[PDB]
Design a protein around this ligand. Structure first.
Ligand SMILES: *Cc1cc2c(cc1C)Nc1c([nH]c(=O)[nH]c1=O)N2C[C@H](O)[C@H](O)[C@H](O)COP(=O)(O)OP(=O)(O)OC[C@H]1O[C@@H](n2cnc3c(N)ncnc32)[C@H](O)[C@@H]1O
Ligand SMILES: *Cc1cc2c(cc1C)Nc1c([nH]c(=O)[nH]c1=O)N2C[C@H](O)[C@H](O)[C@H](O)COP(=O)(O)OP(=O)(O)OC[C@H]1O[C@@H](n2cnc3c(N)ncnc32)[C@H](O)[C@@H]1O
Ligand SMILES: *Cc1cc2c(cc1C)Nc1c([nH]c(=O)[nH]c1=O)N2C[C@H](O)[C@H](O)[C@H](O)COP(=O)(O)OP(=O)(O)OC[C@H]1O[C@@H](n2cnc3c(N)ncnc32)[C@H](O)[C@@H]1O
Ligand SMILES: OC[C@H]1O[C@@H](O)[C@H](O)[C@@H](F)[C@@H]1O
Ligand SMILES: OC[C@H]1O[C@@H](O)[C@H](O)[C@@H](F)[C@@H]1O
Ligand SMILES: OC[C@H]1O[C@@H](O)[C@H](O)[C@@H](F)[C@@H]1O
Ligand SMILES: [Mn+2]
Ligand SMILES: [Mn+2]
Ligand SMILES: [Mn+2]
Ligand SMILES: [Mn+2]
Lengths: 570, 579, 59, 59
C-alpha cells in the first residue's frame, strides 16, 4: 500500500505530493483529466537527458507572450461550467416543419441541471480538469490574507489556526514564507515596466493628497522575468512537481495516474459520529476499468466543488430533485463563500503621455532611455511607451476600512471583444473583489438523480449574499469608479459593471477547516472529523469570508496537512 | 553532418522525417513553435515499458497529438472552438484609423493625421484583395493538432486533356499518371490513417446519409452521398474517437531507439532563411546551410546534404522569399532566383449554413424503413426507455453525421454535411444539438498569374519574418461557379431541415478554408512552376518544398492527403539521390 | 455624415461591390467632413413646430 | 478637464440610490447628441466678434 493517496493534481495536490515524497513516503496521485501542458528539465528540450514535466503554465508558450490577447481563448476552452439551469425558451422564427420544443415537451438537454434555481446560482462557477488544475491558466496573483490587530475583531480574512494569538501569527508568518517559496511569489518582476511604474507611482502621488490616503503596491505574482526581459515564466504545478520527475529517487516514490477518476472513497462503516477510516479509494480509468487503491492516508484535493463532490459521492456505500445526504460529514457544503466582482477598463489620460516623456520621480534613467529610444525610432507614434512594455501589476491591500481586494492590471481573461480601435499600451483593467460572510444556509449540494459528464453527482448551488455583503458591494463599485477615473476614462464596452456570480472562481468553504468542530468539516490540519486518515485540500478548506486571491493561503493549509500526515504516518 | 534538414513539423514535414529516417538517413527538423500537445507511448526496449502508465517511466511523450482527443472535448465538443481560435494567427490584417466617437475626451486618441501604430497590422495590405481569414498555426504538428481530419482524394476526369482537373498531373502519360496516383494515395491514407467507416453506427449519420440517397436517387439529376473519409478511429469505448495528427507520423522516431538516434527535433527554432552557394538567377545552385534561431531564453548554421521547406503554404514561400536577401516603404522582396514564388495562388470560396432536422424525421428515427437496422432500433429503444419524456428519440452522445458528395465536374465543388468543431457564431442556446446539421460547400478558384502572395521588405510579423501581403481576385468563371454552389447548398439543405436562426446561408470570409495552395507550385511546366513533380526547386540540386503550396491546380476538396502524396514522392527522390 | 469605403468581406462574389479605387457614391454623405472634428450626432427636424414636436420640454 | 469631473460626479450621484442597469453603464455620448449647438449666429455687445447685436439684428 502506498503511504498517501491524493485525488487531484492541481497545485494543492502537488504540494501534498512534493512534501510527502521529500519525507520518503510513497505517493499515488489520480488526476481525472489529461497531462496537456509540459515543459522539460534535465535529470538530476524534449530530446536526450531531459525529462517532460506536466502542469506547465500554458501562457509560457511564446505565441501568448507575443499575442497575449489570444490567451482568452485558452482560458475559455479550459473552463467547464458547474451548474447550468434548464430553460424552455420559445424560438419564434424556426422553420415551422423542424423539430421544436413546446410548453409541455421541453428539450431534455445533456449537461443542464434541472434542479438549479437560477436566482441562487453561482452561474459562472467553473472547473478545469487536467494535470495542474487551474494553475495551467491562472493569473498567478498571490497576496496574503488580512489579519486584524485585534485577534477578536468582528472580521478577518486570515483564518485562525490556534486560540493563542501570538502562536497563530508566528505559524502563519512562516507558512506564508514557505508557500511563497513553493509557488515562487515575487513583487519585483514588473519593476522595469513603464506602464507599471506610471500607474503605481501616479496613484500613490494622487492618493497622498486625497483626504483619505490609499496605498498602492505591486501585486505579488508567482512568476519570474526571463533573461530576455520580453518574456516571463508564469509559475504553475510543474514548479511544485519538478523534482518528482527530475530526481530518480523521488520519481521512484511517485505515481501519477492521469485520465483517472476518483469516484469515491469507501469507508470502514457508515455510522455518523463514530471514529472511522477510509478503507480504499475507488478509481476508474476513463480511457479504453474500476481499481481499488489502498493507502495508509488519503487526501482529496480536487478543488472546491469537486472535493465536496467526491466526499458526497462517498456517502453512498458500494424527489427527482433529492440531494445526497451527508451525515457522516454534516457540514459538507455548508457556509460556502464566493467573491462579488466589479470590473471596468480605462484608456489612460492623454496628459499622462507627457509624464511618460518627463517623469518627475528619481532613479528612472532606465525609463527615460527606453522612451527616448522608442520616440526616436517611431516619431509618429502618438504613444511614447515602448511596444512591448509590460502591463501594470498593481494592488491595494485589503483593509477593514476598504474591505475589498483591488487589482489594477491587465489580465489575460478578457470579458468581451478586444477593442479593435484602441492601442493596448494605454488600456488599464480594474477588478475589485468583495467577500461574502459565511452563512450556514449558503450551500453546495449534490444531486442523487442527475450526474455531470464524468458521471459524478451534479452540483447545485443555493447562494444568497447577506445585507451587509450587498452594502459592501455598493461601496466597492463606488470605490472602483472613483479610483479608475483618476488616471483615465472608461473604454466603451468595459464601463463599470458587476460580473456574473462565481466568475472569480474563488469559491471557498465547501470543506471548511477550523477550530470549531461542530461547524467545520475538518480540523486546522485539514483532517476530516472522525476519520483518522482522511484529509482535504484547496480553497474549500478556507472558513472565513475573504476578498483576496486564495491559492497561497490554500497552499499554507496543504503544508500543515502534509506535516500532520508525515507526523502520523511516517 | 545531417542527411536532411526539414523546416517545419506539421504532417508534411513529419512525412519527410518518417520516410527519410526509415531509409536510414539522419534528419534534423526545426519548428518555430513549441511542442504543446502530447500523447505517451511505451518506449521500445525500455525495462519499464510493459507495466508503464502514460507519462510515467518508461513511456515517451510524443508531440503533435490532436488536441481534440482530450476527453474534456469528446464530452463538451462545442468548447473546442476556443482551441481553434487560440491556435490561429491571422496572416495579413490591414491598418485602419476609425474614429471612436464616445471616448472620454480626456483620453489618449487617434486623429486623422496621427493614427495609432499597431505592430503586426500590415500597412501594405489592400483589404479588397485580401485573404483576410488566412491564418497559420505555429506548434509541433502545425495545424494537424486541431484539423477536422477530412481526407478525400482529388478528382481526375476521364479525359486526360479535360480543361479542368483537381488532381495535378505527375506524368504526361495518362496511364503512368494514374498508376503513380493510385500508389501514392494508398500510401498517404495509411500514413494519416484514413477511414470511411468510423460513423457507421451513428443514427444521425445514417439518417442523413440514407435519407439523402433515397431523395436524390429518385431525382432526374442523381447526386451520390457518401461517408466523408476521415483520418481517425473510433475507440473500443465507442463514445470516443482518436483523431489522427502528426503524433501518428512521428511516433516511431520517438519510440524506437534506433530511429530516435537518427532524428533531432529542435522546437522554438525558427528557420530564418536558407543561404545559397550564390545569388545569380537562372544558374545551377545549391543550399549552403540553413540559418536557424533559437527563440527561447543563439544564431546557428545547420548543414545538411538536402533541405526541405515544409512550413505551410504561406510560411514556406516566406522562408524562400527571405532567403533572397544574402547575408517604397511598401516595397516587396523580389524573388528572381525562384520567379514563380507566390504566383498563381488559389483559395476556396466557402458557403455555410446550419439546419434543424424536420420533425417528420423523428418518426423515421423511431421506425426506420431500411431493412436490417437492428442496431439502430436497439439504441433508440434504450434511449426512449431511459428518457420517455424526451421529444428527440436520438440517443444522447450519438455521433454527428459525417457525409460528403464527391466533387464532379457537373457540380464542381466539395460538399461536407456534418458537424464541425469550428463553430462560426454563438452556439445555439435553445436548440438541442442532436437535431442540428452543418453544411460547408467549398469551391475552387482558377490558378492565375496575377494572383499572388508577396513579402514586404520593411514590415515584419511577430517572429521577425517578412510580412505576407495578398493580391487575390477570383475570376468571372470562379464567381459563376460560387453562385451555383450557394444555390446547390440551399436546395440540398432544405431537403431535410430548415435553417437555424443565426446560421442562414452565407459566404464566409476569404481565406477561412485555410486551403491556400499554389504558393510554391510544382508540376511539369517548368516555366510556370517553382518545383518539378518531385518538388525539387528549379536550379537547386538539394532544395525541396512541401505542403499545400506545391499543389498547382484549382481544387475544392481538402488538400492534406494530396499534399502528403507529394511529400512521399519528394522523400523518395531525396532517398534515391542522397540515401 | 462622413464618407466611408469599408470592405464587406462576406458579399456573394458575383454581386455589385465597392473597391479600393471605386467606392459607392452615397448621396447625402459629406466628403469634406473630417470624422475626428465632427458633431456626428448633430441633427435637424423639419416640420411645423421644428423640434418642439418631440422635445423633452426642460426649460 | 470639466468633462472628467462631470463623469465622476455622475457616478458618485447615481450610486447613492441605485446600481447601474446592464447596458446603460456610465458613458459619454456621441458629440452633437444634445442638439444644443449654439453660437452659429452669435449675438452680443462685441460687434467685431458677433453676427448680430443684443437685439439679434445682423450687423
Ligand atoms: C482559471 C483561473 C483561475 C485562477 C485565476 C484566473 C483564472 C482564469 N487567477 C488566480 C487564481 N487564484 C489565485 O489565487 N490567483 C490568481 O491570480 N485562480 C484560481 C487558482 O487557479 C485556484 O485557486 C487553484 O488552482 C486551486 O488549486 P487546487 O485546490 O489544486 O484545485 P484545482 O482546481 O486547480 O485542481 C484540482 C484538480 O483535481 C481534479 N479532479 C477533480 N475531480 C476529480 C476526481 N473526481 N478525481 C481525480 N481528480 C479530480 C481536477 O481535474 C483538477 O486538476
Ligand atoms: C486549422 C484548421 C486546419 C484544417 C482543418 C480545420 C482547421 C480549423 N480541417 C481540415 C484541413 N485539412 C484537410 O485536408 N482536411 C480537413 O479536415 N485543415 C488544414 C490542414 O491542417 C493543413 O492542410 C495541414 O496541417 C498542412 O500540413 P503542413 O503543410 O505540414 O503545414 P502546417 O501549417 O500544418 O505545419 C507547418 C509548420 O511549419 C512551421 N513553421 C512555419 N514557419 C516556420 C519557420 N520559419 N521555421 C520553422 N518552422 C516553421 C509551423 O509553425 C507549423 O507547425
Ligand atoms: C429633438 C429634441 C430636441 C430637444 C430635446 C429632446 C429632443 C430629442 N429636449 C429639449 C430641447 N430643448 C430644450 O431647451 N429642452 C428640452 O428638454 N430640445 C431642443 C429644442 O427642441 C430646440 O432647441 C428648439 O426646438 C429650437 O427652436 P427653433 O430655434 O425654433 O428651431 P427648430 O429647429 O425647432 O425649428 C427650426 C425650423 O426651421 C425650419 N427650416 C430649416 N431650414 C429651413 C429653410 N431653409 N426654409 C424654411 N424653413 C426652414 C425647420 O424645418 C424647422 O421646423
Ligand atoms: O477573471 C480573472 C480573475 O480571476 C480570478 O480567479 C483571479 O484570482 C484574478 F487574479 C483574475 O483577474
Ligand atoms: O473552417 C472549418 C473547415 O475548414 C477546412 O480547413 C476543413 O477542410 C473543413 F473540413 C472544415 O469543415
Ligand atoms: O437626448 C435627450 C436629451 O437631449 C436634449 O436635446 C434635451 O435638452 C435633453 F433634455 C434630453 O434629455
Ligand atoms: Mn457572489
Ligand atoms: Mn504548521
Ligand atoms: Mn501541525
Ligand atoms: Mn477566395
Amino acid at each position: 500500500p502506498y503511504d498517501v493517496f491524493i485525488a487531484g493534481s492541481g497545485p494543492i495536490g502537488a504540494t501534498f505530493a512534493k512534501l510527502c515524497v521529500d519525507a520518503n513516503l510513497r505517493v499515488c496521485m489520480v488526476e481525472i483529466g489529461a497531462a496537456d501542458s509540459f515543459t522539460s528539465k534535465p535529470m538530476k528540450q524534449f530530446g536526450p537527458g531531459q525529462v517532460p514535466i506536466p502542469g506547465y503554465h500554458k501562457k509560457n508558450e511564446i505565441e501568448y507572450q507575443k499575442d497575449i490577447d489570444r490567451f482568452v481563448n485558452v482560458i475559455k476552452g479550459a473552463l467547464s461550467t458547474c451548474s447550468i439551469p434548464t430553460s424552455n425558451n420559445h424560438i419564434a422564427t424556426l422553420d415551422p416543419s423542424v423539430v421544436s420544443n413546446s410548453l409541455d415537451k421541453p428539450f431534455i438537454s445533456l449537461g443542464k441541471n434541472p434542479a438549479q434555481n437560477p436566482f441562487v446560482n453561482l452561474g459562472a462557477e467553473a472547473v478545469t480538469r487536467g494535470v495542474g488544475g487551474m494553475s495551467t491558466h491562472w493569473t498567478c496573483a498571490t497576496p496574503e490574507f488580512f489579519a486584524p490587530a485585534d485577534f477578536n475583531a468582528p472580521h478577518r480574512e486570515r483564518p485562525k489556526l490556534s486560540t493563542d494569538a501570538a502562536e497563530d501569527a508566528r505559524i502563519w508568518k512562516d507558512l506564508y514564507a514557505q508557500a511563497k517559496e513553493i509557488i515562487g511569489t515575487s513583487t519585483t518582476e514588473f519593476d522595469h515596466s513603464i506602464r507599471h511604474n506610471l500607474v503605481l507611482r501616479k496613484y500613490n502621488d494622487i492618493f497622498q493628497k486625497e483626504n483619505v490616503i490609499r496605498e498602492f503596491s505591486p501585486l505579488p505574482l508567482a512568476c519570474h522575468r526571463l533573461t530576455d526581459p520580453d518574456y516571463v515564466e508564469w509559475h504553475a504545478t510543474d514548479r511544485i512537481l519538478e523534482e518528482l520527475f527530475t530526481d530518480p529517487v523521488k520519481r521512484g516514490r511517485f505515481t501519477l495516474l492521469t485520465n483517472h477518476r476518483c469516484t469515491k472513497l469507501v469507508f470502514k462503516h457508515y455510522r455518523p459520529g463514530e471514529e472511522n477510516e477510509v478503507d480504499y479509494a475507488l478509481v476508474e480509468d476513463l480511457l479504453p476499468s474500476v481499481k481499488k487503491i489502498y493507502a495508509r492516508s488519503y487526501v482529496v484535493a480536487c478543488g472546491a466543488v469537486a472535493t465536496a463532490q467526491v466526499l458526497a459521492n462517498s456517502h453512498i456505500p458500494p424527489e427527482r430533485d433529492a440531494t445526497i445526504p451527508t451525515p457522516l460529514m454534516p457540514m459538507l457544503g455548508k457556509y460556502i463563500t464566493e467573491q462579488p466582482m466589479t470590473f471596468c477598463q480605462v484608456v489612460l489620460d492623454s496628459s499622462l503621455m507627457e509624464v511618460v516623456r518627463n517623469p518627475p520621480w528619481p532613479g528612472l534613467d532606465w525609463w527615460k532611455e527606453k522612451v527616448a529610444r522608442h520616440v526616436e525610432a517611431f516619431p509618429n507614434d502618438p504613444i511614447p511607451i515602448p511596444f512591448r512594455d509590460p502591463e501594470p501589476q498593481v494592488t491595494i491591500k485589503f483593509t477593514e476600512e476598504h474591505p475589498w481586494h483591488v487589482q489594477i492590471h491587465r489580465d489575460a481573461f478578457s470579458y468581451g471583444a478586444v477593442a479593435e480601435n484602441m492601442d493596448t499600451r494605454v488600456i488599464v483593467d480594474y477588478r475589485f473583489f468583495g467577500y461574502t460572510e459565511p452563512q450556514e444556509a449558503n450551500e453546495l449540494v449534490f444531486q442523487q438523480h442527475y450526474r455531470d459528464a464524468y458521471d459524478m453527482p451534479q452540483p447545485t448551488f443555493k447562494f444568497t449574499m447577506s445585507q451587509d455583503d450587498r452594502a459592501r458591494a455598493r461601496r466597492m463599485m463606488d470605490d472602483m469608479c472613483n479610483i479608475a477615473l483618476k488616471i483615465g476614462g472608461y473604454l466603451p464596452g468595459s464601463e463599470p459593471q458587476f460580473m456574473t456570480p462565481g466568475l472569480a472562481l474563488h469559491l471557498a468553504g465547501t470543506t471548511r477547516c477550523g477550530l470549531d468542530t461542530q461547524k467545520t468539516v475538518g480540523n486546522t490540519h485539514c483532517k476530516v472529523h472522525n476519520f483518522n486518515n482522511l484529509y482535504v485540500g484547496g480553497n474549500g478548506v478556507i472558513e472565513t469570508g475573504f476578498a483576496a486571491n486564495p491559492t497561497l493561503t490554500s497552499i499554507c493549509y496543504a503544508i500543515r496537512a502534509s506535516n500532520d500526515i508525515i507526523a502520523k504516518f511516517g
